[PDB]
Design a protein around this ligand. Structure first.
Ligand SMILES: Nc1ncnc2c1ncn2[C@@H]1O[C@H](COP(=O)(O)OP(=O)(O)O)[C@@H](O)[C@H]1O
Ligand SMILES: Nc1ncnc2c1ncn2[C@@H]1O[C@H](COP(=O)(O)OP(=O)(O)O)[C@@H](O)[C@H]1O
Ligand SMILES: [Mg+2]
Ligand SMILES: [Mg+2]
Ligand SMILES: [Mg+2]
Ligand SMILES: [Mg+2]
Ligand SMILES: [Mg+2]
Ligand SMILES: [Mg+2]
Lengths: 265, 265
């Protein structure tokens, strides 16, 4: 319908990002529990990202996959926009990592499997996330991982330009077939996560922003002793400077270390 | 300053795009001739491209190169936005091609040289145009080519995301060093132009939009008999399906066919 605020009972904050203030909510007629992600219009306008929010809604709302958070709808008033999200009751992977410091191999491999299933669904539909990180990985009621926060995602086949439908005559194949953007970006992220999950720190961590930038551009990481051979092999394959040398998701899902340790298919 | 409409005397239309209605104009205090590109706010909003206009202004206004059209400033009222452009007195390459049907080798090579100089300036600053085509190539007072219409251009180092300055920890090298976008897109365009300039038709031309899409994705072009060996070599090198096999601009500028025929350094 055209949902509005008065259709919901509001509960506690679930989390805060740079932009979203997310609240537990209950729809009044159904008593169905969900999450409201609230954004300030003034802040969206000041940062120049109103377009991104539009894309977050257009792209996420159409995805259907158990490892991807549903977005059900939206509404707005004079000062705010409200996104109606599936409620993830077990929090963020970020918070679980604060709690446990580091994950064992079985938990890590299980998370990587679920993330790779979600990203293969996305990438097969030309959706690229571009913001994979622990705070945007939520946990459902059986502890299964759910990708969320499609703020920076892209989907060339539904892009503004594609919809304008200009002449193709001067455009290369990569652009006309909605292949303009590189999905390998998400594969790097997956490697960063797998390392961080096992080690408790991301591979390119440093004091300053400048030192961090250097570490990443040079791919300067090392492994602690306890990281096993199989885990080193997978991380090393994902963290390639050259995007085209990073593996297909099918190779992540079938990696021997993954298949030996993952509890999920 | 804050220019407004009443600072200008308006003359004849210079051209029309999908969005810009461009007019000859004279600044009243100086009597300096320039062009006003006028956009309708309602149309920008309906097509969802207000962000692109912002980027057109931010990126173009800072470029300084004789083969790139200057953008001097902008202003707006209730229904319109006005871009203050350098006036190109000799029209579009599109119109010259309608007039002559096809260009000889010296004119073609000269245009390709000027375009490649302009694009090497851009690409060295991480500016990618993404809309190179004859209607967006203007002619200055000595018949020199000027790239224009930065509607679809990108410049990652000044992008909204870069300015937000989030954590780098999960992002690959390509993204943190503002290398996220592929400049090879413009090289393909240059190949399409070189063919069209010599032949009078673009290489992938077909009746329908669907047939055109196929021709491009399969790179199905052939040469007429009169296209010389040197020209075939350059076009063939630019029109590669794989973006990474397309040559550097320095190889275009130093191509033997280019250097034998071009009147410009
Ligand atoms: N559906 C949800 N269920 C539970 N908590 C959520 C949900 N969506 C977001 N959160 C929490 O709110 C935070 C911010 O939400 P997010 O959509 O990532 O906003 P932003 O776009 O500002 O990063 C998340 O990191 C998480 O802590
Ligand atoms: N500075 C200029 N001097 C002369 N003619 C121009 C100038 N700018 C644009 N034109 C003409 O107006 C047309 C539309 O302008 P353009 O900026 O390309 O608009 P759009 O963004 O709608 O494609 C050009 O193809 C050309 O015919
Ligand atoms: Mg987030
Ligand atoms: Mg976000
Ligand atoms: Mg965002
Ligand atoms: Mg144009
Ligand atoms: Mg344009
Ligand atoms: Mg445009």
């Amino acid at each position: 319908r055209q949902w509005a605020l008065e259709d919901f009972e509001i509960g506690r904050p679930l989390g805060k990002g740079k932009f979203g203030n997310v609240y537990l909510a209950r729809e009044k007629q159904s008593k169905f529990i969900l999450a409201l992600k609230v954004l300030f219009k003034a802040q969206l306008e000041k940062a120049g990202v109103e377009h991104q929010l539009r894309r977050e809604v257009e792209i996420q709302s159409h995805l259907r996959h158990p490892n991807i958070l549903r977005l059900y709808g939206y509404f707005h008033d004079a000062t705010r926009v409200y996104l109606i999200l599936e409620y993830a009751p077990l929090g963020t992977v970020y918070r679980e990592l604060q709690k446990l410091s580091k994950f064992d191999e079985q938990r890590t491999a299980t998370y990587i499997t679920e993330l790779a299933n979600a990203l293969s669904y996305c990438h097969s539909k030309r959706v690229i996330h571009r913001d994979i990180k622990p705070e945007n990985l939520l946990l459902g009621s059986a502890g299964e991982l759910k990708i969320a926060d499609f703020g920076w995602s892209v989907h060339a086949p539904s892009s503004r330009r594609t919809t304008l439908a200009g002449t193709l005559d001067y455009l290369p194949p990569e652009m006309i077939e909605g292949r303009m953007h590189d999905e390998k970006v998400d594969l790097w992220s997956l490697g960063v996560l797998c390392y961080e999950f096992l080690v408790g720190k991301p591979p390119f961590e440093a004091a300053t922003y400048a030192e961090t930038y250097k570490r990443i551009s040079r791919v300067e990481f090392t492994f602690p002793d306890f990281v096993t051979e199989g885990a080193r092999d997978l991380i090393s394959r994902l963290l390639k400077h050259n995007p085209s040398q990073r593996p297909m998701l099918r190779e992540v899902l079938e990696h021997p270390w993954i298949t030996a340790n993952s509890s999920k298919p």
